[PDB]
């Protein structure tokens, strides 16, 4: 009875450690995605100041407009996965506390 | 500051001598290297502090 | 008439060269170049002719 | 309005009452 | 004739912008009154808690319900505060737009009263600033239309919040009296 | 698994040694240095692969390593079940 | 009164430090020498 | 008894209330009733 | 020729003033970037304070003795102050 | 209780060596 | 302790349910005003506008690097009056171009 | 008694280091302001060297 | 909407930078010297104001970070002092009170426990 | 062609690292099995 | 009971004073070239509260 | 009974953690490859 | 060039003073019933610096 | 409290983590000296 509690506790320990590594990786992923929005927006901004007839709606313009929206969609997906990861880590911490209280008794 | 002074003084070259030369390329690359190496030293100092 | 046509022609080449400079800077703008930044609302601004 | 800034440490740590309402139990025995 | 038709088209949106903020203010006042009602409601529930704790299954359940009622009232109070802040922000956005409309209307009205027999006209030099602008008539209409639509959406959200306010206050009061009985 | 890993490592090295080569060939616009004449490379081809075969080779490697990962996962869970039955 | 275990065992990976290059994160917002980068 | 809302007893109305959200499940709260009928 | 040399002087003056203002704006951009980075470290550091306060508050519900010592009041107040500090730092990050 | 005070002084001496 | 927290240390209950004490926390309780400045180009973007008199720009001695003249600390050695050296700036056509005097 | 006396010693040491820091901060800000003033004067002298070319 | 050959989109660019819900501006030839002077003046004044805003923000940020640092450090030290002083008061509750006291910020096991401050399940008073 | 070879290289790297961690876990399971077998 | 009532009333007054201080300090800090600056419809109106000194 | 409830809660939490871990990794690399490809195509159109 | 070296030396001294004051406040804030309170190895020793007043 | 196996176990755990951080600090010390030489040589080459 207590041996199974100890084994489940050790597996919960491994899972919460790996979940911490996963949420650190998610943070590193969403931090890195900012620079692509940097590049797309500073490409779009300096091409607004081309001369009179040269202000042309090239397919690069539409592609750079699509750039911002797809990068934003990626960032929103990563934020939702961050919230899901935090919820899973919280559930793991609750199971940790319950198993520790069980092992105390 | 030496490179910044050399950049500011060389703009005052006169009307037909405002020319991109080897010195301009080398000076701009030196200022870029200075800035990159400053940021790298700052981050390494932060790592040492941690 | 030849001079007027040549002038209307030459004033197009300055715009071509200015656009060449702008798009050559924008094409060489990778991640961590030195000076990429954030311009809020620039993805929907379109003053095109 | 427009595309929001793709940065964390602004909305990552949620407000304390961004969670739900849970009607708690509290005292089991009389005080 | 063209400047006069522009004046009429500007006056219509100016009156709409006035009416929108006059509708938003009167909703903000009722939201403030309901926040004051919640303030008095959270204050009024401490007395029953003191009475119950002095008296200390039925009493424990009354203590349970009291604590749950005050936490719910606290969350609802902050709900009302956030909605009031959003209403004020939308009113101020419409306000700045209306101020721009007013001074443009005055400028065009002064532009209308010009004829050849009039004095106080001069030879201004030709400039590119006389033909520069930041909008077209369609964009100028839609920029205002979006503000009006967003303000109406916020007013509808505030009236839904007020109905929720009255419902939750009535249910909490009657539940507490039922458990007290 | 170690054999599959070694195959993947060989593929990585041979991918690197071609990415570097063609990246060097990219920054060779004109008026450069080390520029020397090589006639007769019109008819000499010497190629060994096709782009479809080139892609499907790496797809074969990726799916093979995924198969071995699935086998390893199955062995791990079966070992866990054996531990739990034999403890009792 | 036993310790209830709060971390895994000392099977942690080795702490190797890597040079903090720019990569994709620490880009400045302004070109340091940009007034001198004009057409001539 | 931890549940997700309020669960009023006079009228069955689950009050789910997240951050800046609400979801009332039961009889609709149309107007304000000065004499609240306990049902 | 006099008009030409006057206009050339005016244009050169404008270019010099533009370069000076550009250099000062660049320096201030770098400084604001440093400030933003420091605010980010501050928020990340206060998150740990909130975590340790909450994990101290959780484990004291297991007492068979289950007392309202004023250490519990200190812990509740600590959670509230840390959360409020995080909100002000987030608004500061917005403005920066 | 004297040992706790001794330990407190000891940590004060070592905390100022950094 | 403040006496507002010792009320919870009694078996009876006569306290305010709101844990932050009203007379201690400097923020207003359930305040509905928030002075927000939307970014308009060319104007003053001021922050912490809600407290202006009781909290000035400087309250201690901090080294804020690369600071211009109108935001310098109170007692700092600088140039009160400057040598003129530039009447009539030609770029903007201003005959006394504006010079900032400290304090 | 000796613990309270060490309170007083640590407090006075803290005050001494604090006021060192304050007046060194005044010195640093003064150096920054003077560096700005002298750099501006050097810039004006250099731009007055340009006016000897016409 | 017509394409004038000297195309001038700068005012629309400024209005879109300030208010960004504006629609795309899509499809008497030369400035005066007073326009040139006013443009130079507006550019210099805009740069000055933008520099002053962030210079004003920096000093308040620098004060606020240190103020929050001192306040949170004092609060955490108060909490651990009072928990150990309860530990001294006790000397099963003793076990977890010591384990609560010997728990710093880095620590060994720490996790978010959301909604823990709401529950007050208490049956006893210190006196 | 550079974009294509970069995509394939990144996918191969990810699969290599997954195979590596699975192999390490399998070796850990084998060592734990041998310890349990030698304990008896 | 009476002391608790008096505390609640003084609590409400303290909220009022703090909000008035916030609003009046924000009003004082406004000047020219401030970005929230505009005209308003009837700013000289008296609202329904209208308390004297 | 209570031991059964504790064991099932632990098993469900661990299973959710593992499935989230593998899905997180696949999502991270899918967005990484997509972002790099769209960046390369955007820098190609400018050329 | 001379003033920059003066500024650098002043900045280094100011940084030393800052973090010395931080660690001194941390040393003062310690008292009894604290987790860090323990026994040390040669606390009395004269350090390598020993820079008197 | 603790079995002498457990009483040993706590101390060799603490010793292991201390030695691991000593090795990490040694690696960082090597790294700083490795990068400063490249810093100085790059500056010298570019000034020349």
Largest sheet properties of chain D = none
Please give the radius of gyration of chain D in angstroms. Answer: 18 Å
Shape of chain J: rod-shaped
Shape of chain D: rod-shaped
Roughly how many Å apart are the termini of chain J? Answer: 27 Å
Quaternary organisation: part of a larger assembly
The helical percent of chain D reads: under 10%
Describe this structure in words.
The structure is cut from a larger assembly and holds five copies of chain A, four copies of chain B, two copies of chain D, two copies of chain F, one copy of chain H (39 residues) and four copies of chain J. By secondary structure, chain A is mainly alpha-helical. Chain A has helices at residues 2-32, 34-46, 59-104. Chain B is an all-alpha fold and 50 residues long. Helix content of chain B is 74%, strand content 0%. Chain B contains two helices and no strands. Chain B has helices spanning 2-10, 22-49. The two termini of chain B are 31 Å apart. By secondary structure, chain H is mostly beta strands. Helix content of chain H is 0%, strand content 15%. Chain J has 18 residues and is mainly alpha-helical. Chain J is rod-shaped and about 25 Å long. Classes of the chains: A mainly alpha (105), B mainly alpha (50), D little secondary structure (31), F mainly alpha (88), H mainly beta (39), J mainly alpha (18). Chain E: Microtubule inner protein component of sperm flagellar doublet microtubules.
Summarize the model shown:
The PDB classes it as structural protein. The structure is cut from a larger assembly and holds 5 copies of chain A, 4 copies of chain B, 2 copies of chain D, 2 copies of chain F, 1 copy of chain H (39 residues) and 4 copies of chain J. By secondary structure, chain B is mainly alpha-helical.
Outline the secondary-structure elements:
The structure is cut from a larger assembly and holds five copies of chain A, four copies of chain B, two copies of chain D, two copies of chain F, one copy of chain H (39 residues) and four copies of chain J.
Chain A: H1 2-32, H2 34-46, H3 59-104
Helix pairs in contact in A: 1-3, 2-3
Chain F: H1 2-26, H2 51-87
Chain H: E1 14-16, E2 23-25
Antiparallel strand pairs in H: 1-2
Summary keywords:
part of a larger assembly, 18 chains, B: 50 residues, mainly alpha, 2 helices, elongated, Tektin bundle interacting protein 1 (chain K), Tektin-4 (chain E), Tektin-3 (chain I), structural protein, microtubule
